[model samples]
Target: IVGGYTCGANTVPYQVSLNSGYHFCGGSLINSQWVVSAAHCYKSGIQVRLGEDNINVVEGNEQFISASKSIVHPSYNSNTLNNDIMLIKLKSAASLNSRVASISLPTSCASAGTQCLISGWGNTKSSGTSYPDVLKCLKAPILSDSSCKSAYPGQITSNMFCAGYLEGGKDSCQGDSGGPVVCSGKLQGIVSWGSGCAQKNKPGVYTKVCNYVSWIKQTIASN
Candidate 1:
């Protein structure tokens, strides 16, 4: 979910905007024709920006693509934040370029405790204001299923995965939803929800990418 080509810009390149101008986190290109993002980001008047640094500075140069259609996982529930995954079919495909490259989807799920990276324009501190022009990233380790379940008790389900620092310094906050949780250079999960940003006992939850391979393939084919 990194955005803006310049140093210290808060705009995330692949995130989409809804409700005229409200923005939500999302991910890089997966192919020339598709972009991965959170299901909750899809709505009328949402715009996808590719290739730009600052939302304000590059606003003119960025290619604004409209979503022809939005496909969310059938099981997505905003209340619980379950199955919070979606794919956007762009009005047209984007050309390959240095600043507009696509990210690869995970070939398979990584084992528990694997290390990964999460990036966004979310608040640097929990409940803080989001950076308006710079993207931020932090490394986090994946949590084992049992460990995540124990931490969240009645919340972490089988379709979800968890990652963040147990020590609580860095994490994905409210504005980081739908961003990428990349492991071994491949997209492994989508940022979903958590009790609080960077809480000591709670890691950020994410949609399990490996579990949705069939759905992804089918959706792509159908499109």
Candidate 2:
């Protein structure tokens, strides 16, 4: 994430890294056996690593677990980038501890201008391969639907929203997709897409997670 700082150890207990030999995407632990991420990150042979502060080092608190199944939202549109959420079931339940835990889901939608925290191990530069080894976090404000639509006319959907400064300098970038954007201590969005990463008037867009509350629970329940 641009304009962010490295996260403290155990600070982001619910955050996870999706590894296929390397960290490719980020995710949030929703329960002992399930994680929420962006559907666009889906691929075969994904291993989820929990309680990871830095991917480059062997942190004793880390838990490397394989995925038993991955469920992408039925209506996800790659072209429009709508409904970009996914759920991955762990082969085994994650052990809850001081350095590993699950985050709560949002009960209500966050309003415009609401401050939220976004964490990831994505690239820190807008133009370069500067992905961080350690997790980083940035605070951004949710933009109103009207503002978000104007930023990308004909692109914004009910399943998507934008956050970050309109003037740029901060946002979730490459390798951060599927990570958490939390508001009011709840998971509110997932890093999905953006216009070239932190450009002027081009805010980072996310999957509107609160809209999928029922879908998430139902999927977990029926599976």
Candidate 3:
């Protein structure tokens, strides 16, 4: 949770802060109008903040847009956190520039043990206090389906995957949900559910991006 360090400005232009009068979660701008995030993050008064390094300050690079619509996967299960992904349609299109742009989405799954990075304004500590004004990031390795399944048991499904450390100390915790898990400069996973922040034998679970590529494309086109 608190193990990640600051990401600094202009490093992750596509990273967004999902705010509901407050920072609720993180998301990734996949296109000028579409934002990808976790389904469980949807709530009233939600909006997306783009191009901000320090969330507390409205730097010249920042753009705040209200959500025209929030579309959750039809199969998403709140209790189980299955199909735990969503897309937000921005009320106005983002003005792409040096400080604001979309991240590439995955066309295929990352192989297990592939090195990846996750970024968010999540809690700097597991106790849920001291969230950084600036974003933070950490490198994590994707776990094999066999190893991920072994860690999560019946919870791991074909649509879901795991990343982070088995020995603990690094992970996407509370407030980091719906964030980007970027592998090879592409969006491979969306921060979803997890056992706890950096728990032993437990890693971060995500909605595998490749598994719903077709669905994501369809959703954006339809909406």
Candidate 4:
């Protein structure tokens, strides 16, 4: 499932709607000119809506932005799920308002045991039922680096981090890829993968933003 903002029970924070009305997972604003999300979130001929509480109500308080360019990570590997990150350059910078603001990315993201918040419109349950149009959120503690490595083996590279409940009730699911994993009001990770939605011994894995600071800075500067 995809991830975005969590409003009340009725709507999500960010939802991408194609011309055909199909929605997918995406992320939030990183800067006035960029929206950081997953590369897989991009589909041909799609329009992105940001700073919205619900998808159904597209009036005031909800702002839509068009993407002038979609840049996927060059090393992204769909098979092994490596580097699954992307940035969307908005056609114009979004106005800074209460509903819209850029999230900060830390130079040194917290390591294991850090508590983080994850939000999305992914499946509420793990059975792949269906994606919710409304955004939902849950908090999870980061797992020890060694613990995560033990769980996923070599898959938990230095560029990735793990978070979620160990009891198997909360996580980023099928449609939640590309969402942010916020910790201490700063963005530390990007939801990328896991064994399942919320399974025991399998925590949600995210792209380590700290490892990519140079890349992110270069991308933002060049664009």
Candidate whose TM-score is highest: 2
Model 2, span 99-204: residue lDDT tens:
8899999998999999999999998998777877888999999999898889999888888899999998898899999999999899999999999988899999
What TM-score should be assigned to candidate 4? Answer: 0.88
Residues 58-159, candidate 4: write the lDDT tens digits. 657755666788888888888766787888887877776666677888879696788887877667777658667666777788888888888888686677
Residue pairs whose backbone atoms clash in candidate 2? none
lDDT of 3 at 216: 87
The lDDT per prediction is 0.71, 0.93, 0.89, 0.71
- At residue 156, give the lDDT of candidate 1: 80
The C-alpha TM-scores of every prediction are: 0.87, 0.98, 0.96, 0.88
Worst 10 residues of 4 by lDDT: 11-20
Clashes of 2: 0
Off by over 4 Å in 3: none
Model 1 spans with C-alpha error above 4 angstroms: 1-19, 59-61
In candidate 3, how many Å is residue 96 off? 0.5
Error at 78, model 3, angstroms: 0.7
Pairs of residues at least 3 apart in sequence or in different chains that clash in candidate 4: 1-173, 1-174, 1-175, 1-176, 2-175, 2-176, 3-120, 4-120, 12-135
* Deviation from truth (RMSD, Å), model 2: 0.7
- Whole-model lDDT, candidate 3? 0.89
The root-mean-square deviation over C-alpha atoms between each candidate and the true structure, in angstroms, is 3.4, 0.7, 1.2, 3.0
> What is the C-alpha RMSD, rounded to one decimal, of candidate 4?
3.0
TM-score, prediction 1? 0.87
